[PDB]
């Protein structure tokens, strides 16, 4: 019934809009009218302002997500974003501490809830809008189905509106009103014995262990011999290469040079970016972020080490040769699997590079924005 979602400026389950429609649900919003009072929490619960730059606050958020965040459809895996990933994800340029919102249970003084936003310029159907990207919504497992989530959502909405920002972007595995795009995820095995042992992957009588291993073997040589970790000097080159590539899509963030530096400069165990420089010019780029999963109840392994395709552009190779190199660089950095969504040009290489179709899909939503939906090939933004 979406008793909560139907009260919000998002499309109804049956709404479809033509390609020309591209506008807010509610316009002419006035900052001066935004409620100034915090949304009421149940008795015994309080808002808490997280300082993600403070290691101990950051560690509380970490512990909350580790224990209570998103699981795969069979509840075999749970996302285990690292503390250093959270810091990177949450302190991008012009970020507001005030958009990093915790809920504590007063008597234990423990964090039981969290939601966060960061500001981003989003171009939707060629209109660039100041938006907030919402992420890390989490309610403790002991407190599910008590309608806390709408309170967290209303409170971040109010705080976003205070900054005169009226649109948001978010992604979920769950179906809500109403996705502007739906993207399946696909997986390319690197450490197949491990994937076989934890049941990320399966064998049959055609496919013995040694045959599966051979299938997914890769040559330890790049197609683009000079692909190297990105360095500060490459920032303008990356801003030029990526900013222009992205113009082609129907939904993409507009990056400043300061954002390109934040989002791409390598950080071990968080973000990996490689570039191919041809006489001072950045001609190709590969990026992926590190997002391990906790393996629940497996005697041998605790962690699934996984690389997540971020942004990839080539002008000197084929997209297939570029993504092959992506897989090889993931393998070199001890990732067990390389994951991609069917956005941008990615689907075109999945068959040949031996990706398998996953279990489900990631839905893209906008808040307070009416437009035509589109196939995932036209989505040019990957969230964290």
Ligand X SMILES: CCCCCCCCCCCCCC(=O)CSCCNC(=O)CCNC(=O)[C@H](O)C(C)(C)COP(=O)(O)OP(=O)(O)OC[C@H]1O[C@@H](n2cnc3c(N)ncnc32)[C@H](O)[C@@H]1OP(=O)(O)O
Binding residues: 2, 4-5, 69, 136-137, 139, 143, 145, 147-149, 299
Out of 94, 301, 318, 352, the only residue in the binding site for Cl ion (CB under 5 A) is 301
Distance between CA atoms of residues 90 and 270, nearest Å? 13
User: Binding site for tetradecanoyl-CoA: what residues are annotated?
Assistant: 2, 4-5, 69, 136-137, 139, 145, 147-149
DSSP per-residue letters across 137-190 = EEE-GGGTTSSHHHHHHHHHHHHHHTTT--EEEEEESS--S--SEEEEEEEEES
CA 383 distance to own-chain centroid: 3
User: From CA 218, how far away is CA 325, in angstroms rounded?
Assistant: 10
**With binding defined as CB under 6 A, does residue 61 bind ligand X?**
no
Among 27, 145, 204, 205, binds ligand X (CB under 6 A): 145
The span from the CA of 328 to the CA of 352, in Å, is 15
Residue 273 binds what, of ligand 3F3, ligand X, Mg ion, none (CB under 5 to 8 Å, by partner type)?
none
Q: Is 182 in the site for ligand 3F3 (CB under 6 A)?
A: no
Nearer to ligand 3F3, 237 or 358 (CB): 358
CA 332/CA 311 separation, integer angstroms: 18
Any bridge partners for residue 367, and if so which? 168
Question: Rounded to the nearest whole angstrom, what is the least distance from the CB of residue 369 to ligand 3F3 in the complex?
Answer: 19
Per CB under 6 A, which of residues 108..137 are in contact with ligand X?
Answer: 132, 134-137
The sign one gets for the Cα dihedral 13, 14, 15, 17 is positive
Instruction: Give 9 or 173: the residue with its C-beta nearer to ligand 3F3.
Output: 173
226, two tokens: 């000079």
Of residues 90 through 149, those in contact with Mg ion by CB under 5 A are 139, 146, 148
Structure tokens at 75: 């509840």
Q: Is 99 in the site for ligand X (CB under 6 A)?
A: no
Pick one of ligand 3F3, Mg ion, ligand X, none as the site partner of residue 84 (Cβ within 5 to 8 A by kind): none
Binding mask 11-50 for ligand 3F3 (x = CB under 6 A): ----------------------------------------
b/e sequence 355-369, b meaning 16+ C-beta within 10 Å: beebeebbbbbbbbb
Near ligand X by CB under 6 A: residue from 367, 371, 376, 380: 367
Burial of 1 (0-12, 13-18, 19+ CB in 10 A): exposed
Q: Which is nearer to Cl ion, 124 or 337 (CB)?
A: 337
Cα angle 324, 325, 326 (rounded to 5 degrees) comes to 90
Contact status: 93 vs ligand X (CB under 6 A): no
Non-local CB neighbours of 92 within 8 Å, separated by 6+ positions: 118, 120, 259, 262, 263
Q: Any contact of residue 303 with Cl ion (CB under 5 A)?
A: yes
H-helix or E-strand spanning residue 321? helix 319-332
Residue 100, classed as helix, strand or coil, is strand
Binds ligand 3F3 by CB under 6 A, chosen from 263, 308, 311, 364 = 308
Q: Which residues bind ligand 3F3 (CB under 6 A)?
A: 70-72, 77, 79, 171, 173, 185, 291, 293, 304, 308-309, 339-341, 362, 382-384
For ligand X, the binding residues (CB under 6 A) are: 2-5, 68-70, 132, 134-139, 144-150, 153, 156-157, 160-161, 165-168, 170-172, 174, 176, 367-368
Residues at the interface with Mg ion (CB under 5 A): 139, 146, 148
- The contact set with Cl ion (CB under 5 A) reads 301-303
């Amino acid at each position: 019934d979406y008793k909560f979602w139907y009260t919000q400026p998002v499309p109804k389950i049956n709404d479809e809009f033509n390609e020309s429609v591209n506008e807010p649900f509610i316009s002419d919003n006035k900052v001066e009218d935004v409620r100034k009072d915090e949304y009421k929490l149940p008795p015994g619960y309080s808002w808490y302002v997280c300082d993600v730059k403070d290691e101990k606050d950051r560690s509380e958020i970490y512990t909350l997500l580790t224990d209570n965040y998103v699981e795969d459809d069979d509840n075999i895996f749970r996302f285990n974003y690292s503390a250093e990933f959270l810091l990177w994800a949450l302190t991008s340029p012009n970020y507001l501490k005030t958009w990093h919102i915790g809920v504590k249970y007063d008597a234990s003084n423990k964090l039981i809830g969290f939601i966060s936003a960061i500001p981003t310029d989003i171009c939707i159907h060629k209109r660039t809008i100041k938006m907030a990207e919402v992420n890390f919504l989490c309610v403790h497992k002991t407190l599910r189905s008590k309608r806390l989530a709408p309170v967290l959502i209303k409170e971040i909405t109010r705080r976003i509106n205070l900054e005169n920002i009226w649109q948001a972007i978010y992604t979920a595995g769950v179906y809500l009103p109403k996705p502007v795009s739906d993207a399946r995820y696909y997986h390319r095995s690197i450490n197949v014995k491990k994937l076989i042992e934890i049941g990320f992957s399966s064998l049959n009588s055609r496919l013995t262990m040694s045959r599966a291993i051979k299938l997914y073997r890769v040559e330890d040589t790049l197609n683009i011999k000079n692909m190297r970790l990105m360095k500060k000097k490459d920032v303008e080159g990356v801003h030029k290469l990526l900013g222009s590539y992205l113009e082609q899509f129907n939904l993409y963030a507009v990056f400043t040079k300061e954002e390109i530096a934040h989002w791409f400069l390598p950080i071990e165990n968080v973000i990996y970016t490689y570039v191919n420089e041809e006489n001072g010019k950045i001609k190709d780029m590969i990026s992926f972020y590190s997002l391990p999963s906790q393996i629940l109840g497996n005697d041998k392994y605790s962690t699934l080490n996984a690389a997540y395709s971020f942004y990839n552009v080539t002008t000197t190779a084929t997209f297939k040769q570029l993504m092959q190199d992506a897989i090889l660089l993931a393998k070199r950095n001890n990732f067990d699997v390389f994951n991609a969504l069917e956005v941008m040009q990615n689907k075109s290489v999945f068959e040949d590079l031996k990706f398998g179709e996953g279990d489900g899909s990631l839905k893209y939503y906008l808040y307070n924005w009416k437009c035509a939906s589109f196939a995932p090939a036209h989505v040019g933004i990957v969230l964290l």
